[PDB]
C-alpha cells in the first residue's frame, strides 16, 4: 500500500485501520495496538434493546398496548416513555431518568472494549511462500489454534452481552411497572395488555405527579375502591 | 370509527417503549435470531488503504529487502543510521549487487 | 416515514381517475391512512380512511358509493378510484398517515 | 369547527386565533389541531397530543383547549408567516375527521 499523511495507531498491509472496534477481519498481521483478529464475517453488539413494530390497527377500534404486546413507533424523547388516557386527550411523554441510567449503562458496557486494546508490537511471521517442514507447520498450528480460540472467544462474548443487554433493558422495564404498581397501590389494577387502569378521576397533574414519583395515593385511594370493588 | 369519548371517571396511563422499522437482527445464547432496534458492527472489515506515520515512525524500502539495506546496496544507500518503529518491505523488492 | 402519490392525470367529466399512494419508512399495515382534498378557497375536505392491515374503509357523509379505495400490501401501496366527475370535484387531493396519539401525522 | 374570518397583528405583536365548537366535537374530550398552511402546496401540524410540539415548530406558537374552545397564540411574530389557518377536531355525532373553515390577512 502507498504511503500518505494522516494519523492512525496500527498498521496492517491493508494500510490504516481505525482502533474504534475491538475485533477486525482485514489482516492477522499486524502493528500496533490493533485489535483482535477473528474468522466470523460479522459480528453485532446489541447496542439497544428488543425490537417490536408496532400494530397500531385493531379492526375498526384500533390498539394502545405497550410493552408486552406492541413497541411504540414515533417517540424519539428517549427510550421508555409513558402514555395516558383521560378526559383531557391522549398523550405522551418521556422518564428522562430511567433512560439515562440506561444509555450510562450502555456506554460504559461499550467503553469497556473500545479503545481498550494491547501492544502487539513483534510477533512470529504469519505468512509463508514455501514449505519447510516441522517447525513451519508447528507456527501455522499455534496460529490457527490462537485464531480459533480467540473466535469462540470473541463469539460467546457478544452472545453473553447481548443476552445480559437485553434482559437489563427488560428488567428495568419490569422495574418502573412495579415501581408504579406500588406508588399506585390499590388505586390501580394491571390490565395485563401492558399497563395499568387507574380506577379514579385523574387529570393532567394526576399523570404529572405518577412520572415524578410526588403521587400521594391516600387522597384518591378513598375513591378508587369506590370505584373498583 | 373510534373509541366512544373518554370515560369521566377512568385513567388508562401506560407505559412503553420505543421502536424502529429497519431493526437489525441480532444473536443472543438463547435465540439465533432476534431484532434490534440500534446495533453496531463490532468488526471492521474495511481498511482506509494507504499507510500513515503520524504516531509511529515508518520506514519504507521502495527497492529493496530489509537484509539488502542492511548489508548495503546504492539502491537503497539513503538507509543508513535510519531508525524507525516499522519497516515495511515491498514485494516488488529485488536483491542487486549479490545472490 | 413519507407518502409519496401519483395525480397528474386529468379526466373529462363523467370518467373515472386512478390516484395511488405509495408509503415508505413504516410499517405499512400498521396505521390508518387518509384521504382528503382540497379547493381553492376553500378548507379542506375530508373523504375517507383505509386500514391497510384488512379491508375495512370509512366513508364521508357524502362520499358513499362514487368514491371507493383498496390496498396492495405486497407493493405496501394504496389506490382511491373516483368516478362521475363534476365540476365541483376539481381539487387537489391529499394522502395522510394517521396516528392515534400524535394527531394527522405525516401528508403527501 | 370554525376560525374568525379575519384577524391581524404588526409584527412584535400577539395574535390570538380561537376554534369554535360544542359538547359534541371539543366538549368529548378529543384533541384540538392547528394546521398552518399555503391553499396551494400543503398544511403543517401545529400542537401535539400533549402541549408539546412535533420537534420541528419553533417556540412562536403556543396552544391550549379549555371546556369548550381551543385557542392558539402567537407572540414573537415574524416576517416567515404563511397567513392560513384552519381547525381540526373528531366529531361524534358525525365519525368523520372534521377540519375547520378560516381565513387571516397579516396587516
Known amino acids: 500500500a502507498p504511503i500518505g499523511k494522516c494519523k492512525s495507531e496500527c498498521i496492517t498491509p491493508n494500510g490504516s485501520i481505525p482502533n474504534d472496534k475491538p475485533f477486525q477481519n482485514v489482516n492477522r498481521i499486524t502493528y500496533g495496538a490493533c485489535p483482535r483478529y477473528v474468522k466470523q464475517s460479522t459480528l453485532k453488539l446489541a447496542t439497544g434493546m428488543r425490537n417490536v413494530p408496532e400494530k397500531q390497527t385493531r379492526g375498526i377500534f384500533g390498539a394502545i398496548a405497550g410493552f408486552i404486546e406492541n413497541g411504540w413507533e414515533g417517540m424519539v424523547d428517549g427510550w421508555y416513555g409513558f402514555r395516558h388516557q383521560n378526559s383531557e386527550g391522549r398523550g405522551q411523554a418521556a422518564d428522562l431518568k430511567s433512560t439515562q441510567a440506561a444509555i450510562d449503562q450502555i456506554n460504559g458496557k461499550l467503553n469497556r472494549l473500545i479503545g481498550k486494546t494491547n501492544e502487539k508490537f513483534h510477533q512470529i511471521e504469519k505468512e509463508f511462500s514455501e514449505v519447510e517442514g516441522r517447525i513451519q507447520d508447528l507456527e501455522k498450528y499455534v496460529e490457527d489454534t490462537k485464531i480459533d480460540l480467540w473466535s469462540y472467544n470473541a463469539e460467546l462474548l457478544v452472545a453473553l452481552e447481548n443476552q445480559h443487554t437485553i434482559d437489563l433493558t427488560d428488567s428495568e422495564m419490569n422495574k418502573l411497572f412495579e415501581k408504579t404498581k406500588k406508588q399506585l397501590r390499590e388505586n390501580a389494577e394491571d390490565m395485563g395488555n401492558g399497563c395499568f387502569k387507574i380506577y379514579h378521576k385523574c387529570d393532567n397533574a394526576c399523570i404529572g405527579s405518577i412520572r415524578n414519583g410526588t403521587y400521594d395515593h391516600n387522597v384518591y385511594r378513598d375513591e378508587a375502591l369506590n370505584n373498583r370493588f | 370509527q373510534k373509541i366512544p369519548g373518554n370515560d369521566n371517571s377512568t385513567a388508562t396511563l401506560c407505559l412503553g417503549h420505543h421502536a424502529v422499522p429497519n431493526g437489525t437482527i441480532v444473536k443472543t445464547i438463547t435465540n439465533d435470531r432476534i431484532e434490534v432496534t440500534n446495533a453496531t458492527e463490532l468488526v471492521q472489515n474495511s481498511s482506509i488503504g494507504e499507510i500513515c506515520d503520524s504516531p509511529h515512525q515508518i520506514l519504507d524500502g521502495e527497492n529493496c529487502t530489509l537484509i539488502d539495506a542492511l548489508l548495503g546496496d546504492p539502491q537503497c544507500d539513503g538507509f543508513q543510521n535510519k531508525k524507525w518503529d516499522l519497516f515495511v518491505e515491498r514485494s516488488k523488492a529485488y536483491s542487486n549487487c549479490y545472490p | 416515514v413519507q407518502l409519496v402519490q401519483s395525480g397528474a392525470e386529468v379526466k373529462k367529466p363523467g370518467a373515472s381517475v386512478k390516484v395511488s399512494c405509495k408509503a415508505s419508512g413504516y410499517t405499512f399495515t400498521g396505521f390508518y391512512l387518509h384521504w382528503v382534498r382540497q379547493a381553492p378557497g376553500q378548507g379542506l375536505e375530508w373523504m375517507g380512511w383505509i386500514n391497510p392491515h384488512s379491508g375495512d374503509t370509512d366513508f364521508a357523509q357524502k362520499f358513499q358509493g362514487k368514491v371507493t379505495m383498496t390496498r396492495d400490501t405486497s407493493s405496501n401501496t394504496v389506490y382511491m378510484d373516483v368516478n362521475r366527475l363534476t365540476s365541483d370535484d376539481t381539487a387537489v387531493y391529499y394522502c395522510?398517515?394517521?396516528?392515534?396519539?400524535?394527531?394527522?401525522?405525516?401528508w403527501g | 369547527l370554525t376560525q374568525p374570518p379575519s384577524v391581524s397583528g404588526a409584527p412584535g405583536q400577539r395574535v390570538t386565533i380561537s376554534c369554535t365548537g360544542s359538547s359534541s366535537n371539543i366538549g368529548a374530550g378529543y384533541n384540538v389541531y392547528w394546521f398552518q398552511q399555503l391553499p396551494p402546496t400543503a398544511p403543517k401540524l401545529l400542537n401535539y397530543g400533549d402541549n408539546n410540539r412535533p420537534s420541528g415548530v419553533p417556540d412562536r406558537f403556543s396552544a391550549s383547549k379549555s371546556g369548550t374552545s381551543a385557542s392558539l397564540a402567537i407572540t414573537g411574530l415574524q416576517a416567515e408567516d404563511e397567513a392560513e389557518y384552519y381547525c381540526?377536531?373528531?366529531?361524534?355525532?358525525?365519525?368523520?375527521?372534521?377540519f375547520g373553515t378560516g381565513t387571516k390577512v397579516t396587516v
Open positions: 395522510v398517515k394517521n396516528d392515534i396519539v400524535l394527531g394527522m401525522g405525516v
Open positions: 381540526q377536531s373528531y366529531d361524534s355525532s358525525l365519525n368523520a375527521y372534521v
